Design a binder for this molecule. Structure first.
Ligand SMILES: Cc1cn([C@H]2C[C@H](O)[C@@H](CO)O2)c(=O)[nH]c1=O
Ligand SMILES: Cc1cn([C@H]2C[C@H](O)[C@@H](CO)O2)c(=O)[nH]c1=O
Ligand SMILES: Cc1cn([C@H]2C[C@H](O)[C@@H](CO)O2)c(=O)[nH]c1=O
Ligand SMILES: Cc1cn([C@H]2C[C@H](O)[C@@H](CO)O2)c(=O)[nH]c1=O
Ligand SMILES: [Zn+2]
Ligand SMILES: [Zn+2]
Ligand SMILES: [Zn+2]
Ligand SMILES: [Zn+2]
Lengths: 206, 199, 189, 204
């Protein structure tokens, strides 16, 4: 039938390039595809920057269910069998049901997005997406500090690491973000929820 | 140094075999490992001797105890889906403190939904291997575990924890996983299915 | 430590795009690289595989460079294997891209050995021009007609001569069988 | 049909992985058949997992067996272990099976003790739809191991030694590239020796 492919990893891993690669191969077989992207609510963005440059044509949607409405609309080409989704982490939980129904109905769904927000925690609905994806490709970047495989995105404001309670959404590139390995990802004021965690950390440092 | 590998997929995909395979390689290089499993009520082969723990934090307590050999820097964890949320913090802390953590567990419960705390482990895992079984119906790659009782597919609202093997469970592809009374959260979902149904 | 990464698959699989992706990763981390190509996307053209080691030894080479890219590797001879292994042994990361099969479906030049020496292998798929399944083979056609087994290996070109196909849609007239029971088995089936 | 190739050094779990892939079929009631070159009745991993197998002297005998009354017509999957012991003819056999609707899952060593391609396997990489290069753990440094090292009386095996030698930990270990050393390894390119010597000196 259909299925879900999920492309993930930190910033600077080339996630979007990988999505473009997968769509370009469809073009040589003349297989039709359609790409969607979430439109962030700019009222919920702390500081808006105006920029429109993009490497990949996609239809902006305000919410995940609007993908299904678009497919039901006159704008949709009925021969389209592949649905691409970029920057998926900006959707809410509603994307999971959408992607599943698409896959259950004969579509190949190719999804790209960040696995972790700046805190190193799951970004929005992507945790559940991992579970539903038939195929996962977790890409790596290169650690800006040591050059090892980078698995994390680190936000720095004026050289200072971002605090745990800072805003999830902050749009930007190298001016705010670097790719780092686990070892070089530090988040000030990260809490511990287990009762014996800080005891263990103290124990192993002696 | 220190990272997490996650081995996942439906029942009958050989997850435990893959965990065994990964850990067994260590024995030739004299690298010690220790396996943990949650408290849970064959062909030829040796199973992993493993410490039974009632909760994820008990893993760290064990490591700090006189029972743990401090030369051990590889930690195995099987049936991870039976843990609660606290497993993620345990795994991350181990990885941050020089341990290699190799984890196996089901990605989906019988409803086709994320099993326990599993979804978060995908994000925290450096390496993910999603294994496939073989669909009991069509032979394609199987991605889901299906529960039947007396021939009938288990209803959506049945209990999640139900221990057993082939008497209740089979592996199926997406198309052959059906859950009676599965709810739709999005208001346009059933509209779309009916719309697309018409050819 | 050094190593070899190998990107492969048929035409229209996006091999070059994947090579580009991996090198672009390096730029964000301030890691310098250098790409080489055989004679007939920025690269240094070399007439043979050992010339890569000569260029590196020359003073036109940036001493900072720790990553070596090699595109269209199937056009080199077997000498590329030693060169690649030498670089890996001497601290370089070598990222190689090339076709795994020629139009006949047989190993393209030196790549068979390269597979063995590579630490990491990524075999990419294209989309079959005939059925849309995963494509693993490159098919040549000259005038609607499939290329004969004994046609020339090197023939530079794009869609005017070539397509991606799955194994089932890859057909080569006059393909010989070297095993005595192969035709006996095929007739049986 | 199609071809899957499982490879990498000794102690990587290759046979264990073949067994895993084939065991999956049993729960779905899918028949398979395992072949091995040359326990004689089965293939086994080093943790005691095992499957029955037919042993063959050569690749063409696989097709002969499949054409005989001993072959179950329901068989969809063909497994082949220790493939490095076959000759070049294994490629054609594997291709023909894949072309005739069989899934062929193949396991074997990629490199001999010299670090060179083991027998016919270089071509199998090309013909295999799916490649799984497994790693062992370096006996020296604990890094991912990619090579098999042979030792004779505690000393590394010479380049000109016999390729075929049956044995486990008595002779063989798994090592990373850096810890794989073979005395009297020849340089085939006329500028390779001058490169190493130049580059080593560049650390001045
Ligand atoms: C890691 C991270 C990235 N981003 C943004 C930066 C980029 O604009 C975009 C990734 O392409 O997501 C966030 O908004 N929050 C985060 O926590
Ligand atoms: C799929 C599934 C498995 N299981 C059990 C059955 C097996 O005993 C165990 C997996 O080894 O998990 C559940 O309890 N609930 C479920 O939804
Ligand atoms: C498949 C095939 C491609 N090619 C060429 C076509 C393209 O120019 C190049 C692939 O990028 O290789 C051959 O020369 N011979 C072949 O058999
Ligand atoms: C590396 C190597 C292994 N072997 C053997 C040892 C093992 O019995 C078998 C691999 O399982 O192959 C050789 O015969 N020659 C070699 O060069
Ligand atoms: Zn780092
Ligand atoms: Zn099915
Ligand atoms: Zn086809
Ligand atoms: Zn080593």
């Amino acid at each position: 039938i259909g299925w879900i492919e999920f492309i993930t990893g930190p910033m600077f891993a080339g996630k979007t390039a990988e999505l473009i690669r997968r769509l370009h191969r469809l073009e040589y077989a003349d297989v039709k595809y359609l790409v969607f992207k979430p439109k962030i609510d700019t009222r919920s963005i702390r500081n808006i920057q105006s920029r429109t440059g993009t490497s990949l044509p996609s239809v902006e949607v305000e919410s995940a269910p609007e993908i299904l409405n678009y497919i039901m609309s006159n704008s949709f080409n009925d021969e389209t069998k592949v649905i691409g989704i970029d920057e998926v982490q900006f959707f809410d939980d509603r994307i999971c049901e959408v992607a599943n129904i698409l896959a259950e109905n004969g579509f190949v769904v190719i999804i790209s997005g960040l696995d972790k927000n700046f805190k190193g925690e799951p970004f929005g609905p992507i945790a559940k997406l991992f579970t539903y994806a038939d195929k996962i490709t977790k890409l790596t970047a290169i650690c800006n500090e040591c050059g090892a495989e980078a698995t994390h995105s680190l936000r720095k404001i004026d050289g200072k690491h971002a605090d745990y309670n800072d805003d999830i959404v902050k749009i930007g590139c190298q001016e705010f973000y670097s790719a780092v390995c686990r070892h070089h990802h530090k988040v000030p004021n990260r809490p511990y929820l287990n009762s014996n965690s800080e005891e263990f950390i103290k124990f192993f440092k002696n």
